[model samples]
Target chain A: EVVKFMDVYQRSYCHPIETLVDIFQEYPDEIEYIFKPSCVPLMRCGGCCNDEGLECVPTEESNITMQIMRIKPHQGQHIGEMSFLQHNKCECRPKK
Target chain B: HHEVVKFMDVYQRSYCHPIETLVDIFQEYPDEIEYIFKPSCVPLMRCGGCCNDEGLECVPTEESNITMQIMRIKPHQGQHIGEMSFLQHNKCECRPKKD
Candidate 1:
């Protein structure tokens, strides 16, 4: 079974003080930070949604978007992943 | 210190001190972070003839270059640091790295 989904994740690096200062620096200003992550899971199906045929399989391609805030330090390791659903149109016989 | 202001011009000097103080405080802070390096973006296009145009054929080149921007940061903490931002582009007509 192949799983398909839009996956998105992002990582940020900043010192605690610096991060605080950056946030302060933008105070009363129109500065906004948009962090986009990589990899988000979207649901697809090779068979049918009702489990008449095979398991869920991802589509050929997909696009995903995400927003993130704050970066924590932990042995220089930070990663995240999310999964979402997507519907597609296909021509296939329905299971009776 | 009216006399000092008149003689030494302390007021004139103090006017610029606020901005300088902010810089000083920032420099004196515990953490110094910087983004030292980044890769290139890889360009990607469809293979074969041009999709939108005619009389043109897409040829694979000997090498393709990509540029990426990787944000590097140094935290005030020990060796632990935050995440990195990776910007990527697809460039064809070249060998993939590590292949």
Candidate 2:
């Protein structure tokens, strides 16, 4: 039997789709499928999008749906460690 | 809490400032203060390269920035639920904190 695992990573806001596309390109032959969100939001907190002032609000713009697909065993074998590098002026922020 | 610890381990570098702020908040309010940790969505915003090469795009835009959220709840009590949300330009590695 073929066992499947879901590996989730916390990625930056702008390029989730691009990241998935990259993975697919790398193991085009080994991967049988893939899945992820097509679009997502840019906000971090709940209050910004909440309807009621008391409850957390989620902005429609901040909503993100990911894409998911299955990969073939042949493609899985070729998987390797991928690292994401960040440049200055990136979105890494601290809470106040 | 160990699972939270593990999650903290993997993203500590990216969340150093926020995490430190969380700790300070906890220390300042020993009683009647609770916290929720929300992982940010823009950990890879600074990545500059073709998505096919580095698994992400280098272009910078408001949509590309990732951010985490931490909620501080007052009147701490039993079984408080914390939420974690991680946003990114691409999928990389994320797992639930062990119970």
Candidate 3:
């Protein structure tokens, strides 16, 4: 059989984030207490699809949990954990 | 404050399979004529399912070749067709789109 599924330029893939600050732009004051310069794994999904009408989107995902702290003047310091979804797999489908 | 978004993998009847339907093979023939295989209600294993993911699609993962001997009255007009295969989706899953 021929290799039907080719790796196009826009196919979604896992990308490594060097530091949390690189992605978490809104929370400039937030700091990672346990993991310094926290490295996060991101599933980038801007890959090109074979068809022009279809768009690449996350079809399956998994949760990622991490702990961090934020500094506030009135509230002092706070530590907490956050969970976000990471795309485990993606597919080319019709654009919604 | 702690922020979170919960995600779970829920499954239901979402696999592809075949369903029997009444069809007339002669109705699709080019010329109208009496044919063998009367009352042609065949069980075709075509792909059918409701994929949970919007980005995923249910497609045929398995197929089998089919051969039929067309015995028709218009013997002079008939021609031999090569490789009449049917898609038998014995098992299918929510996979990425190829087309």
Candidate 4:
């Protein structure tokens, strides 16, 4: 009798993610923002390419702009704004 | 709605990477001359993965250079040393179709 053991598996796929962004103001005295920027229910790319002909990549993305308030020591609060790119969709395709 | 539920389990996770396999390579020469590599198992890098979208594909984004040494043999002639090189895939990504 002979016993043989082997394993086979699939690759990557698109999914959701919670993205976080942190802003910092650097000066003689370092100051950090009270509000943290984050994006929920965002999509991302993930997976393995088990075959040579396939590639896992982002198919659609969005640029989002956000605003937050920053506080300075003994100073009033100021508005901080920034933009980020987030994945909307992902997929696997044939290599060209 | 029913279709979404059916595939939710398969599409829930996101990941991308490389899969490798070890294979035995055999070579033959016309003049009874042959080369045998000391190591029997050779590594083969293959790209694999699932793109959430059927239209997309997972492919190799990076590669590495590989070299191997072998013993060249001939029935009439003495033994000789030989070397070989190959390109190996190391990274992968999901890419969209080009229009």
Candidate 5:
């Protein structure tokens, strides 16, 4: 095992917030709020949605907090992993 | 107001607040979390994504799936410079401190 990258974290897109809208719809409206931080992100869903642009107040209420990167391998690790390959969990919740 | 930006000094850039967790799962299973803190060169070649004519192209290693933007460029590669980014998927430990 080679230790390539050191300890590094990035708050990029954790999985996908956009698509969850439908998956949540299949269950129930209330189902959305079942998960902690709530399924429907508040800040992102926010004040408005328009190609015209978000001409409204910013809402920090978004349930979605952030996604931090974790390297792979034991000894040497480098690079960042994508949400696709990685399982989205609340690992950072403790850190958050 | 509280801000993650405040933590990043000139020497570092942080994506989110350095989340301090009560559950040190890494300690529980160091192997699973990649608790090993060492150094090597897989990220150096970008997993053969961005290689060096320096012959690092054929670099031999277990290989890893991740990308890193060291924020520097190939000194000889010319102005193809940009905000280089990288990745890694593992246990949520050893993820550089917030400070």
Candidate 6:
């Protein structure tokens, strides 16, 4: 069980798409996750985009529908830094 | 309520701060941690290398910069294996504690 849990996190720092796919492959009917905002800086951890940019008081929730358009076609971390710490606001729901 | 201590269990006891004593305690923070401010944060903000690794700064560098320890959490219900309630390997930097 721990191995599976370990594997669960192996993709913890990966893209939301990758994370969704990983869960679908194994833990179907899951709720995809994102990172906590506070640790984003010094923690230098995995996370997702919220607005087109930050610091704007006019903030928008991470709409999974729109977020995907920004990520891909190369299939994964195209020029992006992917520590494999998975997270994002991709609205892609669970149940693979 | 002391009932909350039920979770504290028998082995647990009131203990002083590990970094404190009658006199060993000293001060060094120039600001004296005056009117400390804290905020609520979630998973996406904690460590997700968002924005193509440029990352989203939830707090402006000019406004705030404080470090907090990470926390471990699980489904209190104990039964959402594949649900959204899952974990970053059963971990997080979640929540707010009062000043």
Candidate 4 per-residue C-alpha lDDT over B1-99 given as tens digits, one digit per residue, 9 for 90 to 100: 111211232223223346543333342223332543323223447455455443565678889766555344453565664554545679888788674
TM-score of 4: 0.32
Tens digits of per-residue lDDT, candidate 1, A5-96, equal 11110111110110011121223241332111111122223221221232233334343322222123232333232222234432333343
Off by over 4 Å in 2: A1-44, A47-53, A62-73, A76-96, B1-99
Estimate, for each residue in A6-89, the C-alpha lDDT of model 2 and write its tens digit: 111132121213221233443355344441211111223211111112322222222222222323434652222232221212
For model 6, residues A1-96, the per-residue Cα lDDT tens digits are 222433333333212331112212222332233221111111112221222122111112221110111232334422111121223332312222
Per-candidate TM vs. native?
Answer: 0.16, 0.18, 0.32, 0.32, 0.15, 0.13
Per-residue CA lDDT of model 5 for A5-60, tens digit only, reads 23221222121112112112433543313211111111121111111122222223
Q: What CAPRI grade goes to candidate 6? A: incorrect
List the candidate numbers ranked by TM-score, top first.
4, 3, 2, 1, 5, 6
DockQ of each: 0.01, 0.04, 0.02, 0.02, 0.02, 0.02
Q: List candidate 6 stretches off by more than 4 Å.
A: A3-5, A16-96, B1-99
lDDT, residue A21, candidate 3: 21
**Model 2, B68-95: lDDT tens per residue?**
3333333244233233333223322322
RMSD of 6: 24.0
Error in Å for residue A4 of model 5: 22
How far out, in Å, is residue A37 in model 5?
A: 7.3
Strongest candidate by lDDT: 4
* Model 4 DockQ, alpha carbons vs. true complex: 0.02
The complex in candidate 5 yields a DockQ of 0.02
Task: List per-prediction Cα lDDT, in the order shown.
Answer: 0.22, 0.25, 0.39, 0.43, 0.22, 0.21
The iRMS of the candidates, in order, is 24.9, 18.3, 19.2, 14.8, 19.7, 21.4
Q: Name the lDDT value of residue A10 in candidate 5.
A: 28
